[PDB]
Amino acid sequence: VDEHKAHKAILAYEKGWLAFSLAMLFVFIALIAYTLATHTAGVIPAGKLERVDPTTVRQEGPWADPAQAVVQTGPNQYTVYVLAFAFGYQPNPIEVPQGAEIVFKITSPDVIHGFHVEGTNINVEVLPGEVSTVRYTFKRPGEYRIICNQYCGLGHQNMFGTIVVKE
Amino acid sequence: SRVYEAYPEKKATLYFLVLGFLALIVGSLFGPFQALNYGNVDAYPLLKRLLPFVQSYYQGLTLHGVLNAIVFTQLFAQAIMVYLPARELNMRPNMGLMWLSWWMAFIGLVVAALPLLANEATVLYTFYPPLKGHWAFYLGASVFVLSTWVSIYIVLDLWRRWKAANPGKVTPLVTYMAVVFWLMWFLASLGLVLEAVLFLLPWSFGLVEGVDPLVARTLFWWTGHPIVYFWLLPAYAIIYTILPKQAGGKLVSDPMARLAFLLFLLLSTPVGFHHQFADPGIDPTWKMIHSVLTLFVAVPSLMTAFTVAASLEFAGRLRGGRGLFGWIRALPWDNPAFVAPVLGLLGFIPGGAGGIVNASFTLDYVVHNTAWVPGHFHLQVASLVTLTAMGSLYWLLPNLTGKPISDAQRRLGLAVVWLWFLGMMIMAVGLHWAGLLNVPRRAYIAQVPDAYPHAAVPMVFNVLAGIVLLVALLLFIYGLFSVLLSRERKPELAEAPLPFAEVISGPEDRRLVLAMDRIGFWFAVAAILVVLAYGPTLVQLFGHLNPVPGWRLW
Amino acid sequence: KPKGALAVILVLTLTILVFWLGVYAVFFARG
Numbered sequence A: 001v002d003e004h005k006a007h008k009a010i011l012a013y014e015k016g017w018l019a020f021s022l023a024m025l026f027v028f029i030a031l032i033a034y035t036l037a038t039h040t041a042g043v044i045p046a047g048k049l050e051r052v053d054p055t056t057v058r059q060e061g062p063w064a065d066p067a068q069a070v071v072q073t074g075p076n077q078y079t080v081y082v083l084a085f086a087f088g089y090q091p092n093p094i095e096v097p098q099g100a101e102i103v104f105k106i107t108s109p110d111v112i113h114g115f116h117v118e119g120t121n122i123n124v125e126v127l128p129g130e131v132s133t134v135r136y137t138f139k140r141p142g143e144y145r146i147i148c149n150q151y152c153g154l155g156h157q158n159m160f161g162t163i164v165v166k167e
Numbered sequence B: 001s002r003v004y005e006a007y008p009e010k011k012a013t014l015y016f017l018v019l020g021f022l023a024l025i026v027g028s029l030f031g032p033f034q035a036l037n038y039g040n041v042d043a044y045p046l047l048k049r050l051l052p053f054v055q056s057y058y059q060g061l062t063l064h065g066v067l068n069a070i071v072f073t074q075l076f077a078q079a080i081m082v083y084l085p086a087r088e089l090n091m092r093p094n095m096g097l098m099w100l101s102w103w104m105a106f107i108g109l110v111v112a113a114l115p116l117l118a119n120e121a122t123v124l125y126t127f128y129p130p131l132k133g134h135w136a137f138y139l140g141a142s143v144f145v146l147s148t149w150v151s152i153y154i155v156l157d158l159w160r161r162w163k164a165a166n167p168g169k170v171t172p173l174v175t176y177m178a179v180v181f182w183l184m185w186f187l188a189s190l191g192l193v194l195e196a197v198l199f200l201l202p203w204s205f206g207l208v209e210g211v212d213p214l215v216a217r218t219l220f221w222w223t224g225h226p227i228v229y230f231w232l233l234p235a236y237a238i239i240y241t242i243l244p245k246q247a248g249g250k251l252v253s254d255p256m257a258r259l260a261f262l263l264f265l266l267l268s269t270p271v272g273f274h275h276q277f278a279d280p281g282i283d284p285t286w287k288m289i290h291s292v293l294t295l296f297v298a299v300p301s302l303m304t305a306f307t308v309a310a311s312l313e314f315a316g317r318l319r320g321g322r323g324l325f326g327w328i329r330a331l332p333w334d335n336p337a338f339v340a341p342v343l344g345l346l347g348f349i350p351g352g353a354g355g356i357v358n359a360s361f362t363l364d365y366v367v368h369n370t371a372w373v374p375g376h377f378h379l380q381v382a383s384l385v386t387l388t389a390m391g392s393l394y395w396l397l398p399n400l401t402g403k404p405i406s407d408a409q410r411r412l413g414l415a416v417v418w419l420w421f422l423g424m425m426i427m428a429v430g431l432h433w434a435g436l437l438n439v440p441r442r443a444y445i446a447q448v449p450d451a452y453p454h455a456a457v458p459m460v461f462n463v464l465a466g467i468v469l470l471v472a473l474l475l476f477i478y479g480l481f482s483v484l485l486s487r488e489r490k491p492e493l494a495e496a497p498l499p500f501a502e503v504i505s506g507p508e509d510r511r512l513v514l515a516m517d518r519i520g521f522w523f524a525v526a527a528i529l530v531v532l533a534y535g536p537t538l539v540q541l542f543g544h545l546n547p548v549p550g551w552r553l554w
Numbered sequence C: 001k002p003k004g005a006l007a008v009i010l011v012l013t014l015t016i017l018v019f020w021l022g023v024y025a026v027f028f029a030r031g
């Protein structure tokens, strides 16, 4: 009968659909998997809990002197201690060699900011009393804008920084 | 009215509905102004003459999010998912509690409301420490939400009272939906509750000096994902149990509907790191774990897609449409209670597809905190959920009140939902696009007009949407008020039954229902996945509290 | 056979794949 045939054929179609559906989600997971295995992985924050005092960051330690916050920490590896604060970045600008592994280490002395480097996959929350750590290699020389993409108060929409990537 | 004497929950439900729709109107007035902003046109000077308590862009945005995404969604979840199970079972709720829940919601709304208006908690709807709002906000929000705890008890009491009266019978379909819906929400709310009582409230009271912001987001996004399944499921309930009959047909499968709901119970809460992909000091492995589980929670939706589409194709053939597409024509495009939820489901196609991108860990670095995100969720909550809610005005208003809907009223409603739908799709394009071009959310971009010059095209779309949606909003306020300010009453309207659908049933149905009906077993499962998902991280982060002082920057 | 629902789920699947694969492309481009 109509309705009894409907239901059997509906359900027989719904059974395959659900199976195709699983298959696809599994392929998606595999393709995510691969990203984790490659250099594209460095943009993922470190899991390490690395706690500071937001209250002294500006007075004591590798955040305190912006004109020294670039440190050769490997053969072709540099560390940059970044301050995100209301409403700007330091150092400004961040100048870095083309082609080296850059390991950013961003903290905040006030509220949560974003650290989002335009044209890149660097897009990290920046919480006070914690260090965000992200690695990357700039393949092109030029100027790259930092945009603050977390609501941090009324100065939010003018919170911009600069990376200069040197030839 | 002798109507309300027999059936008092009718009057309690209606109280819920109105407060929600009031909230929604005020909420959505900020909307076209935020779209204009996203189109580089600053309309705020204007709005502030008209509404001079508004001091910033970011105050409006806070009122918008809180008033639309939290108040209206909850008060609607409350009206639908208490009333419908009451009327399926032809049984009465505990009226004392029903009123109590209402008073809790009204009191909390109004306490929360006061610092929002006086500009003392411009912290947005996520209220992320160390941005420190007025204590009254924290206390407001808290009582508002906890009002749902009473709701939960009311429906479990119903269930229980029905089961004691019917031993050996299976749970009827609607009350099934509501039961697992309320038990899921109970699990899901404990993050924010826990965030509220050990952190926000004591800190805003100045009884402790700082909050650790990483624990706060963590507990927050505990509740934060599954608060969106809490918005969605009432709409889904309507779409499965009422929309069939309004289209001309039947729901094709009770078992498949139930399995949808049960997988939500199981999978809606243990998923929050998808909101914390770019957060430091949370383990990459736990992020992946959450991402895979985020893909599973999409399966009930994929499943809902087939069940509902097969349902509409059914009704359509039974209405004379032939061929691959003729069935679509045969449906009742004259009836607003039909068109609305359906155009809603349409926009949910691109909106669910964006949902899966965002889900996929590394891919999130492209879109996170860009315009893409508000573009994604307007399709989901501002169109599917809201479109369904407005839709139900067209059968629910005359079934609680007795006031008839004219032919004219009906024709305006059709205009309204069309324009709302079209305005939302238009804004999706804009915001999706601006976001791929790195345009941030939560930003008064109109105030830095040379900052995003590469996005001038996508900006044209957001100016358009803002206009289309202004008109839709205006014809909705006028529409809804013409019904609610109507003198004419037919008490025989308030006395009809809700338009529940018939179900096609099949031999497999029985053995399947009985499984899913082992509710305690399924709830304990879902509680288990919660402890496992969040458990090892919370112990980490609690073991290592780094609380920091609060700031007021507005 | 529910030809109609099948055409809808076809549409569904296609949008999903264009979104997901199109964004995968951008990821490695920015990488």
Ligand code: HAS
Pocket: B126, B228, B229, B231, B232, B274, B275, B294, B295, B297, B298, B299, B301, B302, B304, B305, B308, B309, B312, B328, B342, B345, B346, B348, B349, B351, B352, B353, B354, B355, B356, B357, B358, B359, B360, B364, B367, B368, B369, B373, B376, B377, B380, B381, B385, C008
């Ligand atoms: C009700 C409200 C919402 C629903 C539902 C929703 C669905 C999903 N979303 Fe989303 N979303 C995310 C991933 C998902 C996934 C995986 C799903 C899934 O549940 C969706 C699965 C959906 C489907 C598989 C679609 C089913 C399609 C159907 C059902 C249509 C059938 C059509 C028919 C029948 C019509 C055709 C028939 C005719 C007759 C014409 C992620 C990632 O993990 C973020 C973090 C983004 C970031 O970077 O910060 C996020 C951000 C948000 C935020 C912002 C939080 C903030 O303020 O920062 C909100 C409010 C939100 C709302 C909602 N979202 N989302």
Ligand code: HEM
Pocket: B028, B030, B031, B032, B033, B034, B035, B038, B061, B062, B064, B065, B068, B069, B124, B125, B126, B374, B381, B382, B383, B385, B386, B441, B442, B443, B444, B465, B466, B469, B470, B473
């Ligand atoms: C006339 C209709 C509406 C329009 C024109 C509109 C417009 C907008 C726009 C452009 C934004 C982005 C603002 C920003 O990120 O800076 C936004 C944010 C938001 N909208 Fe809507 N909206 C409307 C209705 C709704 C509805 C119905 C809901 C929920 C049902 C909703 C919930 C939200 C939420 C949760 C946010 C984000 C809150 C935040 O970032 O803190 N809106 N709205």
Ligand SMILES: CCCCCCCC/C=C\CCCCCCCC(=O)OC[C@H](O)CO
Pocket: A027, A030, A031, A034, A038, C028
């Ligand atoms: C009936 C068929 C059944 C079996 C078939 C299942 C389909 C396999 C799916 C995906 C392959 C994964 C591809 C992994 C390779 C990724 C490489 C890549 O895309 O590299 C680009 C990038 O630029 C480099 O860094």
Ligand code: CUA
Pocket: A085, A086, A087, A112, A113, A114, A148, A149, A150, A151, A152, A153, A155, A156, A157, A159
């Ligand atoms: Cu710093 Cu927004």
Ligand SMILES: [Cu+2]
Pocket: B224, B225, B226, B274, B275
């Ligand atoms: Cu989520």
